[PDB]
Amino acid sequence: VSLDQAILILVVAAKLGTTVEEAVKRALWLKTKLGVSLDQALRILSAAANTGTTVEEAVKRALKLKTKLGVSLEAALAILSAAAQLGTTVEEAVKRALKLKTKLGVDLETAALALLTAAKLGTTVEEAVKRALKLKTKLGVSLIEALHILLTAAVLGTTVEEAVYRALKLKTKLGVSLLQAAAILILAARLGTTVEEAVKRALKLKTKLGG
Ligand code: HEM
């Protein structure tokens, strides 16, 4: 596994409340039974947690949405997640996502990520997008990267500026990417532990899984 995948396995284990070995085995099971990538399997597990449904129910609803709309599995899972976080129906979340996709000129997955991030941050999606675009221009990151920083703030419970501070510090101290730094910070929060412990666990899992 890559460092990204190792971190995400641990995040989704924490989100589902399973053991780490159980998360790994669920991800490989989804790969085999559905023919999806590891990343897609992890997105399925994450969306199951985001929506409070069983993995089976999340897959059923995602495949239905993906087919009805003709969108990516990734986009469908993000929309399901946004609907649950917003406390609304899938149809309502789709309407919001299509509006945003049109206004910004982004793809549906990005729009859904923005809706999810804003709901978790406790802000309107216009305010979240404004802050993300400020990060994009000032830091030279992508919109997707900026939204993950907002998501980090949302999970950690800090201002965006503070999440930026912490992620850039980790980036420089560890030589990781910005997305890796965000994800480690999220992991440490979801584990109730130090960043040092989170990093240690990600590296040990990666070694246990082959390096
Ligand atoms: C650049 C392309 C990427 C895209 C389009 C993308 C998309 C997404 C989307 C749609 C979500 C929300 C869905 C969910 O909660 O299940 C998400 C959440 C997240 N992503 Fe990404 N992502 C990308 C890269 C990465 C990378 C490289 C990492 C790690 C190194 C990462 C780590 C995370 C984490 C930790 C979450 C939050 C999970 C949680 O709730 O704790 N993402 N991403």
Residue numbers in the entry: 1 to 211
Reported in the publication:
We chose closed α helical solenoid repeat architectures as optimal structural solutions to the general porphyrin-based protein catalyst design challenge.
A 1.6 Å X-ray crystal structure of dnHEM1 reveals excellent agreement to the design model with key features programmed as intended. To aid with structure determination, the surface of the protein was desymmetrized by introducing two mutations K29W and K165Y. The heme cofactor is positioned as designed but adopts a flipped conformation, which alters the relative positioning of the heme vinyl and methyl substituents, but preserves the positioning of the heme propionates. Similar flipped heme orientations have previously been observed in natural and engineered heme proteins. The propionate groups interact with a network of polar residues (K15, S46, N50, R190). The open coordination site is occupied by an exogenous imidazole in the dnHEM1 crystal structure. Arg43 in the distal pocket of dnHEM1 sits in a similar position, relative to the heme cofactor, to a conserved catalytic arginine found in natural peroxidases. The crystal structure of dnHEM1 demonstrates the attainment of our design goal: the creation of high-affinity heme-binding proteins with an open coordination site adjacent to a large reconfigurable substrate binding cavity.
